[PDB]
């Protein structure tokens, strides 16, 4: 289709269309399905905690006829707030009065196109925020991008956090020791009362940690000396055999000691301009490798699910005590046909019931 030439209004040139650049989105955790949906009809919720313990038994003389006794159990209660998100957008006639469509010659913009584009942008923003919140919850502390602290699991439940150092820099350092330490921690600190297999865990790491782990002499020589398809594939094949995040079709994967390592490159930008890497650990230089480990869903079964998401109701009329939904979208007409304005609402809080099972991994040594 023809348009005016570059330097003359009386000559025509041909237009071939448009090319669009769309920002990257990752949404890896959101697709694993770790977090269950638990809608509620209130702005807060409670939980009950029960504890008891046993100890060895001391021998007593038969004739004295004395004995021992066990102390009673302890019951406790807790509570949680929830996070509210909202944003606004509007459409006015000045956006469509004489504004050419980018990909055409003499076709005007219409209300429908702007509507669709803006709604898609809103949905993208909310998906990004959901992914960031899920990752923050997995880290163990739920904090808004602005930096506000909403939930502190390690204080809500009186327990500490564990960090595992791998010392990948040292050529002589052993990795099986750290892997076993992680396995024993996960197997012992659950206190679920049932048999637990610690071999079922996710281990998500960053680029530097993955490179250091893969290129360590001890791992490389051990996998090089073996004649088996796994050894061939990893040493001289392609390690990109994992699932798909929001950008790339396969995630770097590595197998060793029965543990599966995955490299996650997800990162987002705050509206202040700074960059929020998802896999980083607070107050640690980005040059050091870092990872996070958490149990699988099958490690305890659906009967004892550990990850949940709560959804609250909208503040507007007609939703006073409704069950709650992931996202609300509303539209209203401006005065005397002046335009249209939209609104999107959300109200949620992700949390964990056994935060002591979240372990951080580091490449340095101390």
């Amino acid at each position: 289709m023809l348009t005016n030439s570059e330097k003359s209004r009386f000559f025509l040139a041909d237009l071939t269309g448009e090319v669009q650049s769309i920002p990257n989105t990752y949404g890896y955790i959101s697709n694993l399905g770790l977090f269950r949906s638990a809608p509620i009809t209130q702005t807060t919720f409670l939980m009950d905690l029960t504890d008891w313990d046993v100890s060895l038994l001391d021998a007593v003389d038969r004739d004295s006829r004395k004995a021992e006794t066990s102390a009673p159990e302890r019951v406790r209660q807790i509570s949680f707030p929830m996070m509210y998100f909202k944003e606004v957008e509007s459409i006015t006639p000045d956006e469509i009065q004489g504004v050419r469509q980018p990909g055409t010659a003499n076709e005007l913009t219409t209300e429908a196109v702007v509507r669709a584009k803006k709604l898609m942008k809103i949905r993208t923003k909310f998906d990004i925020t959901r992914e960031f919140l899920f990752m923050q919850a997995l880290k163990g502390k739920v904090v808004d991008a602005r930096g506000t602290l909403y939930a502190d699991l390690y204080k809500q439940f009186d327990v500490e956090k564990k960090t595992v150092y791998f010392d990948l820099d040292n050529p002589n350092a052993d990795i099986d020791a750290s892997i076993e330490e992680l396995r024993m921690h996960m197997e012992d600190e659950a206190k679920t009362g049932t048999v637990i297999n610690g071999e079922e865990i996710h281990v998500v790491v960053d680029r530097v940690f993955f490179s250091k782990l893969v290129k360590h002499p001890k791992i490389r020589d051990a996998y090089l000396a073996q004649q088996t398809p796994l050894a061939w594939q990893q040493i001289t094949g392609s390690l990109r055999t994992g699932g798909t995040d929001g950008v790339q079709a396969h995630m770097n994967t590595f197998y060793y000691g029965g543990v599966k390592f995955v490299q996650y490159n997800g990162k987002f930008k705050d509206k202040r301009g700074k960059v929020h890497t998802l896999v980083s650990i607070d107050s640690v230089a980005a040059t050091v490798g870092v990872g996070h480990a958490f149990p699988n869903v099958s490690m305890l079964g659906e009967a004892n699910n550990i990850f949940e998401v709560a959804y609250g109701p909208c503040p507007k009329m007609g939703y006073a005590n409704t069950l709650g939904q992931e996202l609300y979208v509303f539209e209203y007409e401006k005065d005397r046909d002046e335009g249209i304005d939209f609104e999107a609402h959300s109200y949620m809080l992700p949390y964990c019931t056994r935060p002591q099972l979240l372990v951080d991994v580091r490449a340095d040594a101390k």
């Binding site: 050529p171 002499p217 020589d221 090089l224 000396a225």
Partner: protein, 122 residues
């Protein structure tokens, strides 16, 4: 005499070997290479004791070093014992070693792609 398992790494073993050779000591184990070299470059080196030799009546027919700053042309394959003989012969001739390229090498015996970077002594 280099005692068995005296070094944890080939990188330090080569340094010890060069330091000993610069002291006038000579070594030759071409005839029983199989019983000295450990499995990999990350195991404990050497696998067994290595004894000095009285004489060094050895001279490669092919040119050594390949060039001024490289013992072998990149990618050359040679018998492992021959590499130690040739590096020793080069050092005897006034050359000095900067580093030994063994980072990504996989197999140690009977053939290896080892190489060295040379300079001039003072």
């Amino acid at each position: 005499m280099i005692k068995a398992k005296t070094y944890p790494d080939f990188k330090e073993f080569v340094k010890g070997f060069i330091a000993n050779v610069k002291a006038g000591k000579r070594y030759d184990f071409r005839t029983y290479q199989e019983a000295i070299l450990p499995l990999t470059y990350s195991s404990y080196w050497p696998e067994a004791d290595i004894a000095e030799v009285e004489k060094f009546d050895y001279k490669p027919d092919y040119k050594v070093p390949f060039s001024d700053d490289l013992l072998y042309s990149i990618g050359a394959q040679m018998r492992t014992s021959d590499f130690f003989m040739d590096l020793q012969y080069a050092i005897i001739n006034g050359k000095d070693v900067d580093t030994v390229y063994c980072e990504w090498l996989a197999r140690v015996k009977p053939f290896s792609m080892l190489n060295a970077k040379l300079k001039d002594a003072i």
